[PDB]
Amino acid sequence: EAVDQNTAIVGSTTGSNYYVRILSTIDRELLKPNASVALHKHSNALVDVLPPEA
Amino acid sequence: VLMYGPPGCGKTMLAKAVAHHTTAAFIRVVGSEFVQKYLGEGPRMVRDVFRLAKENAPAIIFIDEIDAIATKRFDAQTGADREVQRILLELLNQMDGFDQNVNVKVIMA
Amino acid sequence: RTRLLDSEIKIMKSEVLRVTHELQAMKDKIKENSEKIKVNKTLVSNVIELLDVKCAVIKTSTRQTYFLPVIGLVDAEKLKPGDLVGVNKDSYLILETLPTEYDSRVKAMEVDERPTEQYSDIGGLDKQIQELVEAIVLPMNHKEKFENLGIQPPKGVLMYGPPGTGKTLLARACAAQTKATFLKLAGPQLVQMFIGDGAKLVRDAFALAKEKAPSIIFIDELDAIGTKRFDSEKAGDREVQRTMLELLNQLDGFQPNTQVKVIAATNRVDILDPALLRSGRLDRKIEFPMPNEEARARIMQIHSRKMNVSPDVNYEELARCTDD
Amino acid sequence: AADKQTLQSEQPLQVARCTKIINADSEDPKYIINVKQFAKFVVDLSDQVAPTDI
Amino acid sequence: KLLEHKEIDGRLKELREQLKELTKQYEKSENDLKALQSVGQIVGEVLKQLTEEKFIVKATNGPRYVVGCRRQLDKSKLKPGTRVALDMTTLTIMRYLPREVDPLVYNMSHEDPGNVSYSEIGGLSEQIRELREVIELPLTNPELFQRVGIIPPKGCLLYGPPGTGKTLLARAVASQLDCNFLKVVSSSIVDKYIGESARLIREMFNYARDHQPCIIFMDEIDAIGGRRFSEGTSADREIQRTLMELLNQMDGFDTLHRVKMIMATNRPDTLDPALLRLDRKIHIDLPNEQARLDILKIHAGPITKHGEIDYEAIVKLSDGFNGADLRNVCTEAGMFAIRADHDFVVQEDFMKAVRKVADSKKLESKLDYKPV
Amino acid sequence: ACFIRVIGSELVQKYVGEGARMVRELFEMARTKKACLIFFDEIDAIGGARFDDGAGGDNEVQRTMLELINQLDGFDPRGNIKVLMATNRPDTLDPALMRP
Ligand SMILES: Nc1ncnc2c1ncn2[C@@H]1O[C@H](COP(=O)(O)OP(=O)(O)OP(O)(O)=S)[C@@H](O)[C@H]1O
Ligand SMILES: Nc1ncnc2c1ncn2[C@@H]1O[C@H](COP(=O)(O)OP(=O)(O)OP(O)(O)=S)[C@@H](O)[C@H]1O
């Protein structure tokens, strides 16, 4: 879920969902699905989301 | 569609022949792979199968297992309560009646 | 003798080389072995599998995978795929192997109460004395005598007799007179809801017996779940057959090892399968006849000896006036 | 504040979690332990303890 | 007086061996130091190659990430599914490696004890050649099937009384062909869950697909192969499930090249008809007079006996006995001799063993059930 | 005048050796006093034949019962104490309990 501009609560795959900021240049109409987001390890800063997986 | 191969048959062989002459995004599976321990494993399997299927191309996909899998006998409270529950639930909910543009005409035998 | 000077130079060189080996080995070993001990002292995990293209992976106490191209502080032969090893949490190098491939009550199956008892006590079991000795204490120690002749030692015994002739008494006799590896087995303790128990039990016990060659396995009422096979239409469970056939192809089918000491101290053998007695499982099948007339009185006075008795007791009349 | 600083003075010690025992080895006790649920621990004690009070 | 020469020679050779062993040990010590320095390598799994560098992965026991390879892990063969290793620091792929081997396979692939070749147990005189016509026919060479063309079968099925030689037949073939005998018996696959057995079975199929000349042994398929009734217990439904899965695996989609199966059990009648379609039920036939005496001989070679053993006596003393049976006969002969410790063996002891084994036969009943 | 109730049902505890520790507790509290009574029941629920499963579960019973075997009679026997383990049925016995 997104709260504000380029910032969203995002389910993790490690064990702790987080509410992080994202790279703003990402098209705002692309963060709607629970698709394969990608962030930094510690910062957990969203860089982009990938459609496919698994 | 449906087939059934008894002793001295080759019903499956026909399927593989078509699998040759088919030249699109067809995925092969076996319904036996849907029965594990935790919740909805095979159910979620077939769910994501449907998703990726309607995603890539609504061309073709096929699965091969009917016996002991597509079990109309929902009625025995001895064994496979949640197991047969999720099995036949995935079966029917994925029947969807149909979806009319996906995975055209899986068979089984 | 001009070469004596060059020989002395070479000997001083060999002494310096031995001192350099001493340095590089012991001095550096202070550090290296001390770090190894630290990992051992300051603070148990599983091997995954083996490659040498040496190349092994680590399964942790925390259930985590960790490959290494070189194993290091242990030997791959001392290891195998799936081995418990006390390992460096940090380096992920195996330090030592864990030789605890044993379960809790599968290890408790080795008992050590062992109350003492000889063949003199049991009255009416003379042939029992002879054959029990010959097939228990000799396959325990005189394994070569059969090899001297060159055929085989005996392969399993069948202790049968009605309740009041005794067969577990032979278990107690093998316990007292023979001090080999005590490892019991019985019937009721096989009853389980968790389907598939005796398989791993039998496998691990077989390995442990390979470690413990004088492997006495007295299986009282061994016919309990090792039983004649059935054939019906959904009438009967299967896990009994699972463990039974697993033990069949475990003991039989492979692994020739004279360490076998397997006995059935049950009541009847008519319920046993022809798959359970042929020629290598329970070789001899001798009965426990009812104490005939004065064998009964023998057992009786065995009861009637410690407890203080007025010697005005003729056990003959006693045994006679209660026949069968 | 009857003892509101002694509790701030007891602070120099924070050790000794639950740490249940399992078994022990030979040639040195090497008692085996699990802390709460995490793993098995073939430990070597802090020698300022009794080799049998554990 | 060259005492210095030879004395210093001995001292220097001793010090040479000592310093050599100790410096090699110091080298192995620095090597273990490097092994410490060569940190462990977590094993994760690349979920999919997004691009030639962005490999979308998930830790085999953790979260998912996207990293690259070290330098030369040969992405050519590296595709989603293959097992790789990961960097300690950056999780980057440091080394890909062959897939797992699922321990149980080694339990049915590494226990194989080497033993005698294919001439020990009798009664299978004509079977020895029968077994070879399928047992070395593809093993020796399949190029004959380029002249001819016939597609190789997978195996056959045995039967007979329990442990009476079918076990020993398998042992003999194993210790005789000696290539890839996967000694599986499938006795305790289904513990309490559903697809785990079929899962490991699929793994074994893949493993056999790796190497060409694989050999598959399967005795006591009783509670695994079996027959498919209506819905039985949950366990029964699982068994029939894995049955259909095994039956569907037989045909699969791609020919499993150069692998041969060995189906066996005491009661192969238990198998479902949809499964019993195994070129033929080869049998270990009852050793008769000739065969009984042949095995009886072979059980009595290395005895401290003499030219005394009466052959036809034991022959007519018999009512059907296989290699294991007359092995027990010679054994109980040497035992009733060892009763009072006769290091030699007289055929009298053979007859005493005949007594003991005839007493054992009293514990037999209903000794045959025909399959198919 | 001594009667100490210890029911085998409460003795169904889920801590390893805690059962055996209660064994020593009761056995030595009894030996302090005299003419005692200790009443273990539900040995049907406790067990008489040494059932073993690879479940890794009910083995505190194992150690506890071996400790009991050690501490009941012989090794300072009950004497002026009665520690009673009884059943509804002699159904599942063991060659270790028929001892006089
Ligand atoms: N004419 C044939 N030539 C060669 N192989 C054949 C032939 N017919 C059947 N087969 C074998 O059967 C498989 C393909 O036929 P299928 O249709 O799968 O058989 P089926 O009807 O499923 O019968 P089952 O499953 O064995 S009971 C292949 O793996 C072949 O080895
Ligand atoms: N020769 C004998 N010496 C001692 N006891 C004997 C003898 N013959 C019969 N018995 C009786 O048989 C009992 C021995 O039974 P065991 O086999 O040792 O134990 P068990 O649990 O009764 O096993 P069962 O009933 O025979 S299957 C004793 O209680 C004796 O009274």
CB atoms within 10 A of CB E260: 25
CA F8 to chain CA mean position, Å: 8
DSSP 8-state secondary structure symbol assigned to residue F29: H
Q: Hunting for tokens 């962005």 — which residue is that?
A: E54
Q: Say if residues E238 and E228 touch (Cβ distance below 8 Å).
A: no
Region of E233 on the Ramachandran plot (φ > 0 left; ψ -120 to 50 alpha; else beta): beta
Of C168, C189, C192, which has the smallest distance from its Cβ to F95's Cβ? C168
| Strand order across the beta sheet in which C262-264 lies | C184-185, C217-219, C262-264, C157-160, C284-287
Does ligand 1 lie within 6 Å of residue B5's CB atom?
yes
Nearest-Cα distance to chain A for E64, in Å, is 6
CB atoms within 10 A of CB E300: 24
- Residue of C198, C238, C249 lying closest to C219 (CA atoms): C198
Residue C182 CA to residue C217 CA, distance in Å, equals 7
Chain E residues with CB under 8 Å of B11 CB are none
Token pair in block for residue E57: 């992965």
Binding site members of C: 161-168
Q: Hunting for tokens 């037999």 — which residue is that?
A: E364
Interface test with A, best of E55, E60, E65, E88 (most A CBs within 10 A): E65
List Cβ<8 Å contacts ≥24 apart for C26-34.
C28/E26, C28/E29, C28/E30, C29/E26, C29/E29, C32/E29, C32/E32, C32/E33
Nearest-Cα distance to chain D for C124, in Å, is 46
Pick the atom of ligand 1 nearest to E151's CA. Answer: 4
Q: Hunting for tokens 């089918």 — which residue is that?
A: C253
| Torsional sign, CA C159, C164, C165, C171 | positive
Token pair in block for residue C245: 């056939």
List Cβ<8 Å contacts ≥24 apart for E303-309.
E303/C149, E303/C150, E303/C151, E303/E330, E303/E334, E303/E344, E303/E345, E304/C148, E304/C149, E304/C150, E304/E343, E304/E344, E304/E345, E305/E344, E305/E345, E305/E346, E306/E344, E308/E346, E308/E347, E309/E345, E309/E346, E309/E347, E309/E350
C43 Cβ contact list (under 8 Å, min separation 6): C89, D41, D43
**How, if at all, do strands A36-39 and A46-50 pair?**
antiparallel
Nearest-Cα distance to chain B for E230, in Å, is 9
Three-state secondary-structure class, residue D21 = strand
CB contact under 8 A, A50 and E58: no
Counting as contact any 3 or more CB pairs under 8 A, the partners of F are C
Q: Say if residues F1 and F35 touch (Cβ distance below 8 Å).
A: yes
SS (H, E, C) E176-227: HHCCCEEEECCCCCCCCCCCHHHHHHHHHHHHHHHCCCCEEEECCCCCCCCC
Instruction: Output the CA torsion F15→F20→F24→F26 (10° steps).
Output: 70
Pick the atom of ligand 2 nearest to C167's CA. Answer: 17
DSSP 8-state secondary structure symbol assigned to residue A47: E
Residue E163 CA to residue E265 CA, distance in Å, equals 10
With b meaning 16 or more CB within 10 Å and e meaning fewer, what string describes E274-294?
ebbebeebbbbeebeeebbbb
E223 Cβ contact list (under 8 Å, min separation 6): C238, C241, C242, C245, E187, E190, E239
Cα angle: C278, vertex C283, C288; to 5 degrees? 115
| d(CA C191, ligand 2 centre) in Å | 23
Q: Say if residues E345 and E333 touch (Cβ distance below 8 Å).
A: yes
CA E160 to chain CA mean position, Å: 20
Chain E residues with CB under 8 Å of C75 CB are none
Does ligand 1 lie within 6 Å of residue B17's CB atom?
no
DSSP codes joined into one string, C92-129: --EEEE------HHHHHTS--------TTTS-S-HHHH
Q: Say if residues C199 and C241 touch (Cβ distance below 8 Å).
A: no
Nearest-Cα distance to chain D for C290, in Å, is 48
Interface test with C, best of F53, F62, F66, F89 (most C CBs within 10 A): F53
φ and ψ of E346, to 5 deg: -100, 150
Q: Which ligand is nearest to the CA of C300?
A: 2
| d(CA B73, ligand 2 centre) in Å | 53
Q: Which ligand is nearest to the CA of C120?
A: 2
CB contact under 8 A, A14 and E66: no
Three-state secondary-structure class, residue E172 = helix
Residue D10 CA to residue C28 CA, distance in Å, equals 43
- Residue of C49, C45, C54 lying closest to C82 (CA atoms): C49
Residue E319 CA to residue E326 CA, distance in Å, equals 11
Residue E299 CA to residue E286 CA, distance in Å, equals 17
Alpha helix (H) ranges present in A2-48?
none
CB contact under 8 A, D40 and C86: no
Which resolution in angstroms does this entry have? 5.7
Interface test with C, best of E5, E16, E29 (most C CBs within 10 A): E29
Three-state secondary-structure class, residue C288 = coil
DSSP 8-state secondary structure symbol assigned to residue C62: T
Residue C222 CA to residue C282 CA, distance in Å, equals 10
What CA–CA distances, in Å, run from C28 to C284, D34, E50? 63, 35, 48
Q: Hunting for tokens 């020993």 — which residue is that?
A: E168
Identity at C33, one-letter amino acid code: N
Token pair in block for residue B65: 């297992």
Which of C221, C223, C298, C299 most suits a substitution to test ligand 2, by most atoms within 8 Å of the C-beta?
C299
Counting as contact any 3 or more CB pairs under 8 A, the partners of E are A, B, C
| Strand order across the beta sheet in which E55-58 lies | E64-67, E55-58, E45-49, E83-86, E93-97
Residue of C nearest to F52 (CA): C189
Q: Say if residues F18 and F60 touch (Cβ distance below 8 Å).
A: yes
Q: Exposed, middle or buried: residue E71 (CB in 10 Å: 0-12, 13-18, 19+)?
A: exposed
Question: Given CB atoms, is C100 within the 8 Å cutoff of chain D?
Answer: no
Instruction: Please list every protein residue whose CB sits less than 6 Å from any atom of ligand 2.
Output: C 122-125, 163-169, 221, 265, 267, 291, 299; F 95
Q: Say if residues C79 and C56 touch (Cβ distance below 8 Å).
A: yes
Residue F48 CA to residue F93 CA, distance in Å, equals 5
Cα angle: C301, vertex C306, C311; to 5 degrees? 60
Q: Which ligand is nearest to the CA of B67?
A: 1
Q: Hunting for tokens 């018996």 — which residue is that?
A: E185
Residue E133 CA to residue E117 CA, distance in Å, equals 16
Residue B57 CA to residue B51 CA, distance in Å, equals 10
Residue C120 CA to residue C54 CA, distance in Å, equals 60
Residue F11 CA to residue B93 CA, distance in Å, equals 50
Nearest protein Cα to ligand 2, atom 11:
C164
With b meaning 16 or more CB within 10 Å and e meaning fewer, what string describes F67-98?
bbbebbeeeeebeebebebebeeeebeeeeee
Q: Say if residues E287 and E295 touch (Cβ distance below 8 Å).
A: yes
Chains A and D touch each other (3 or more Cβ pairs < 8 A):
no
CB contact under 8 A, E240 and B30: no
| Torsional sign, CA B91, B94, B99, B103 | negative
Nearest-Cα distance to chain B for E23, in Å, is 56
Residue E29 CA to residue C18 CA, distance in Å, equals 17
Residue E210 CA to residue C166 CA, distance in Å, equals 57
The tally of CA atoms less than 13 A away on the side-chain side of residue F65 is 21
Nearest protein Cα to ligand 1, atom 27:
E274
Q: Say if residues E42 and C64 touch (Cβ distance below 8 Å).
A: yes
Pick the atom of ligand 2 nearest to C121's CA. Answer: 3
C317 Cβ contact list (under 8 Å, min separation 6): none
- Residue of E314, E297, E315 lying closest to E121 (CA atoms): E297
Of C72, C138, C238, which has the smallest distance from its Cβ to E235's Cβ? C238
- Residue of A17, A23, A24 lying closest to A1 (CA atoms): A17
Residue E172 CA to residue E117 CA, distance in Å, equals 6
